[PDB]
Design an enzyme around this catalytic site. Sequence first.
Site, short mmCIF file in Angstrom:
data_model
loop_
_atom_site.label_atom_id
_atom_site.label_comp_id
_atom_site.label_asym_id
_atom_site.label_seq_id
_atom_site.Cartn_x
_atom_site.Cartn_y
_atom_site.Cartn_z
N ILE A 61 40.89 36.46 45.87
CA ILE A 61 40.35 35.76 44.71
C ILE A 61 38.96 36.28 44.38
O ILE A 61 38.09 36.33 45.26
CB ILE A 61 40.31 34.26 44.98
CG1 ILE A 61 41.72 33.82 45.34
CG2 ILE A 61 39.71 33.52 43.75
CD1 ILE A 61 41.77 32.45 46.04
N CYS A 62 38.75 36.64 43.13
CA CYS A 62 37.43 36.98 42.60
C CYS A 62 37.02 35.92 41.56
O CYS A 62 37.60 35.87 40.47
CB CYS A 62 37.47 38.38 42.00
SG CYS A 62 36.03 38.82 40.96
N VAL A 63 36.03 35.08 41.88
CA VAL A 63 35.59 33.95 41.05
C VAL A 63 34.15 34.19 40.60
O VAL A 63 33.22 34.03 41.40
CB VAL A 63 35.64 32.62 41.80
CG1 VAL A 63 35.03 31.53 40.91
CG2 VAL A 63 37.01 32.28 42.21
#
Lengths: 148, 149
Positions: free
Chosen positions: B87-89
């Site tokens: 996940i890249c947030v």
Amino acid sequence: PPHIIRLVYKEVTTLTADPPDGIKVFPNEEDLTDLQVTIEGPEGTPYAGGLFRMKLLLGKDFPASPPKGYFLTKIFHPNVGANGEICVNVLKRDWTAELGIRHVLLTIKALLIHPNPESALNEEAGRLLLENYEEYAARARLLTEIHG
Amino acid sequence: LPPHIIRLVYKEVTTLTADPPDGIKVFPNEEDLTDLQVTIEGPEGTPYAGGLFRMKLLLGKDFPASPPKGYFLTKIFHPNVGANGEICVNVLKRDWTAELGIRHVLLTIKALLIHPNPESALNEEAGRLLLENYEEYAARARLLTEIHG
Ligand code: NA
């Protein structure tokens, strides 16, 4: 219209019973289609610490189509226009009439966390967000401290 | 791993676990307080609706100085989820601070399912389709959701 009266009852009671965090709803006793709302600015965003007032105009056709929304609190956000009008891509694209006010407000709160600069009413906010995040956040934080 | 950081993870995971946000459930394991398992329901009115998404949160040694690492275990067609579930947030990478809790991370991930960020896309094809042909992105996303969620 009676469905509006029942509908606001259904919507407001549940919203107040299992409240979403940071969200509160004030039915206008003079006009129940005018729904006032406050949303706390999510932590870890430029809006943190602010209390954002908004209104939801439920048309006669609600819930066949979503309400119109306005931020009454002044805000620096890609998807909020000059008059405070909101543009939410998931609302205008994946809406079905089983959805209600809870969905609307969680979608708007979630938009504070992850704005959509492609569909930007506020083109300055949208360009800063994509190209110079710190400058977007600095301007969003200052309006938050004044108006939230 | 410091003793003061542990006491706060204890209390935070305790209340997080017994009273989570709507659509979130947290399953710590007794072997490792830093291996958190999480399920997130696909928010209604998105292509993930109806699905149950499994993910894990890892609190590294620099927690909470550095944020935790997040992985989707459930396969998902999402612009900001890589091929191995990374996940890249964006808001977490840019607006992170030590005072922000686990609850905040999970809400930000849930919110990311509602409003993906196609410009910071790990999944280039998902991001492209969201911007040019939303209707097919949504179908692909709904299909995988039906199989895996
Ligand atoms: Na977004």
